Amino acid sequence: MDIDPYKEFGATVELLSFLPSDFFPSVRDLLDTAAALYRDALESPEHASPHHTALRQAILAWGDLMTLATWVGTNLEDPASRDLVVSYVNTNVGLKFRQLLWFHISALTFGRETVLEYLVSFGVWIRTPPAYRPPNAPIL
Amino acid sequence: MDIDPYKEFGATVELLSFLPSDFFPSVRDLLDTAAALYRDALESPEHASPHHTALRQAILAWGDLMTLATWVGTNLEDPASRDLVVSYVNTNVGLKFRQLLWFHISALTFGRETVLEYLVSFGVWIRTPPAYRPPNAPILST
Amino acid sequence: MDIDPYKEFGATVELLSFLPSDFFPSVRDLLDTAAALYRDALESPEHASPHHTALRQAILAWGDLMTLATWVGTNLEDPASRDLVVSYVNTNVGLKFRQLLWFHISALTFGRETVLEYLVSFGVWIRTPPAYRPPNAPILST
Amino acid sequence: MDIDPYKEFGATVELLSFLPSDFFPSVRDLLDTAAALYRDALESPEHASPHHTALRQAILAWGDLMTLATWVGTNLEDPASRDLVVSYVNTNVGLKFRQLLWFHISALTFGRETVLEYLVSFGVWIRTPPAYRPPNAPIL
Amino acid sequence: MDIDPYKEFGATVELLSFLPSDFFPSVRDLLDTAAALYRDALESPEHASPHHTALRQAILAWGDLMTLATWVGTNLEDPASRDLVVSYVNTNVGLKFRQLLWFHISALTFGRETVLEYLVSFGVWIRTPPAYRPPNAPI
Amino acid sequence: MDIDPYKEFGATVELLSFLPSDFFPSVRDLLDTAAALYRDALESPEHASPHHTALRQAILAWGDLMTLATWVGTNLEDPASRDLVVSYVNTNVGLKFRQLLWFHISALTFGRETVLEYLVSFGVWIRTPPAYRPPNAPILST
Ligand SMILES: COc1ccccc1/C(Br)=C(/NC(=O)c1ccc([N+](=O)[O-])cc1)C(=O)N1CCCCC1
Ligand SMILES: COc1ccccc1/C(Br)=C(/NC(=O)c1ccc([N+](=O)[O-])cc1)C(=O)N1CCCCC1
Ligand SMILES: COc1ccccc1/C(Br)=C(/NC(=O)c1ccc([N+](=O)[O-])cc1)C(=O)N1CCCCC1
């Protein structure tokens, strides 16, 4: 089955192909962000905004990917393969995740629309070749 | 940090611990069940009940977990520890999803509250002695 | 080209795949059941519910399929491949009809929606483990 | 059991005995017609007119007669009988079918009554002997 | 990514390939027809309907086909440098144009919705029993 | 063929030929973006703004050029069956698209008039010396 996690929110990975894997901040940098004004706002039985409602999944979806990524470092009798495992999740999988995460965050913070209003202004800064590219990205 | 996916829906793994791991029907059986009247209604920009919303992740997290477990069975040189992955996935943790999955799924079929008023029955069904406990377990009918 | 007979009625073979082929009662048993309060009400210029309408074809297509299969058992010179017809008809595809048949039939007895709210139960009945799953399968009562 | 597939629609095979097997166009010629403004109008969950509602059956009723008429050309160890099979369906059975099909089609297209208004004007052109028969058939 | 250049209001491709592909007049017989009273009208910086627009590309896009498909037997080497050039065009995709083009054009003659009422009023008169069917195609 | 697809929108090829041919991002980068919030908007039966319609062609017109660069290596064994295939494409007669494409898209999302006024006060950059011209010339998102 193929569905777009963003779809409903009005987004689509179709435009996330651009975003360089070095864009969104490392996972931990976000995990700490969970302690924001959002920490409490989740351990509370309230749907509120469908945003977190889903995030809360990804969180644990990973909350397990971190409670299992450790079940590897222990019960494992092959000290030559467990070195090429975490070298995929925290790298090639954090990617198709850091976005999944970061996303929601940077939407509740200020506003949803206020975000798309960027992805677009970015989805032009990226394509447009280097030599033909100003210093940094937009603002409001 | 710990939390509960069944929060806003007024629930906790606590009551899940009642449900024997070997209860929720195999994952696939559920994935297929997705094709229900609820399948085609997911690929729509409308959030609707958070059940939908949340559900996606659980799916993705898996539909991107499976398309991950099928990555090891290809890019692996030690056939000794190749089969010790499903010894956790489809098994040890599969339920960690089967619970979620089954949950939402049903919860969406027969309303929400109409669900709790179910898992609560077992909170006494299983609890009671086998000598008395009926043979047929109460399920969702009408 | 592919389509689904259970379209306008909000259904798909998808949910039928759940129903074990060996579920729908033998064709004849159904043909006879046609003689129900719904039999005499077919030979009337009134379309009424499309169930009726559609039903006819399924019947004809068969009542002109059987009066066809009984054409081979007469005009055939190779008794070796004579019995390898029912090895598809009354068997391999008989269900392709038994499904339709049974479907409409019932669907007409206990309303429509009242039907989906049935096949959906099994979408969980069968799905659940045998150790828990009750002995008696829920059916149409009142 | 004996019922008239047309009955309800206000018709009856009683008058189709006339219609020469060479009348209605070959099956394929109709299958292609399915791609008309009717293609989409069926793969959609709408009863609309009881017409197609039934047709949709015949379609598959045959849709299977074409998915089984092929199960013969493969799993069959008698290259002398499968030659006298399709030489019945696409011939003596297409007959008691092409009509079953064609019918509906030529009813939704313009109108139902607008059809019977013909079967009658035809159910007179046919009987009436040859020598005593104009060039072609009517119109409106 | 798949769409339908005719469904820009209510038109499918099926109904085209459904019709005798032998029917749609050659391309040349259409270009020389474009240069008609409709040529000096695509030059204008505006249009009334999209037909005009859709047409430009339909042409431009094509005008870039030949202005390019002509490089098959120039400074190139091969025994059959023109086996798919004039073929693939009058056989596959290339013909789709003979359909497309043909379309818009007439669409500007007696009108638009006066055409659709034809495709049908014909897509049938063709498949109907050539012996019992009327002699004249409806309008 | 003597016409200009930009004329109807008030534009001439020159207005791009002088422009950095190598500017317009790869056809790829474009086709991808196209499927942004416009993808599902073109499939629909509404041409609304001609850009749409005209665009459809471009795609198709190309969707057969992509389907064409595939028959240039089937049963062909030439000394250049994949070397000059993209000599006119990703360079000459293939740019006609990069320009076109890029064009429309931007317009639909940035009004129209405000689109031109951009390139205008831009096709000047490349004309203005490096050390003097302010390294900016943004695409106003207002
Ligand atoms: C004008 O704003 C920006 C302008 C340019 C570039 C970035 C930003 C900022 Br805002 C963001 N960075 C974070 O929010 C963010 C979220 C979480 C963590 N974290 O994981 O701790 C770190 C950074 C950001 O990604 N956006 C994108 C959507 C609209 C604007 C904000
Ligand atoms: C005035 O009309 C006609 C006058 C004389 C003879 C025939 C016709 C035409 Br109309 C018809 N032919 C098709 O519709 C038809 C349907 C489907 C296919 N097909 O399978 O593609 C081919 C032909 C036709 O059978 N009728 C009978 C009912 C009233 C008039 C139309
Ligand atoms: C007397 O009417 C006819 C009687 C029988 C058959 C066809 C026609 C004619 Br008229 C047509 N031929 C062309 O338009 C046409 C347009 C452009 C080209 N072309 O590509 O050059 C070729 C043909 C035609 O398409 N229609 C459809 C709409 C109503 C008028 C007729």
Swiss-Prot record, chains A, D:
GO biological process annotation, one example: symbiont entry into host cell
What the entry says about post-translational processing? Phosphorylated by host SRPK1, SRPK2, and maybe protein kinase C or GAPDH. Phosphorylation is critical for pregenomic RNA packaging. Protein kinase C phosphorylation is stimulated by HBx protein and may play a role in transport of the viral genome to the nucleus at the late step during the viral replication cycle.
Broad class of where this protein is predominantly found: virion
Q: Output the Gene Ontology terms for molecular function.
A: DNA binding; identical protein binding; RNA binding; structural molecule activity
Keywords from the UniProt entry = Capsid protein, Cytoplasmic inwards viral transport, DNA-binding, Host cytoplasm, Host-virus interaction, Microtubular inwards viral transport, Phosphoprotein, Repeat, RNA-binding, T=4 icosahedral capsid protein, Viral penetration into host nucleus, Virion, Virus entry into host cell
Q: Where in the cell is it found?
A: Virion; Host cytoplasm
Q: Which GO terms describe its cellular component?
A: host cell; host cell cytoplasm; T=4 icosahedral viral capsid
Q: What does this protein do?
A: Self assembles to form an icosahedral capsid. Most capsids appear to be large particles with an icosahedral symmetry of T=4 and consist of 240 copies of capsid protein, though a fraction forms smaller T=3 particles consisting of 180 capsid proteins. Entering capsids are transported along microtubules to the nucleus. Phosphorylation of the capsid is thought to induce exposure of nuclear localization signal in the C-terminal portion of the capsid protein that allows binding to the nuclear pore complex via the importin (karyopherin-) alpha and beta.
- Give the record's subunit note: Homodimerizes, then multimerizes. Interacts with cytosol exposed regions of viral L glycoprotein present in the reticulum-to-Golgi compartment. Interacts with human FLNB. Phosphorylated form interacts with host importin alpha; this interaction depends on the exposure of the NLS, which itself depends upon genome maturation and/or phosphorylation of the capsid protein. Interacts with host NUP153.
* Similarity-based family: Belongs to the orthohepadnavirus core antigen family.
What is this protein called in UniProt?
Capsid protein
Q: What is the lineage of its organism?
A: Viruses, Riboviria, Pararnavirae, Artverviricota, Revtraviricetes
Gene for this chain: C
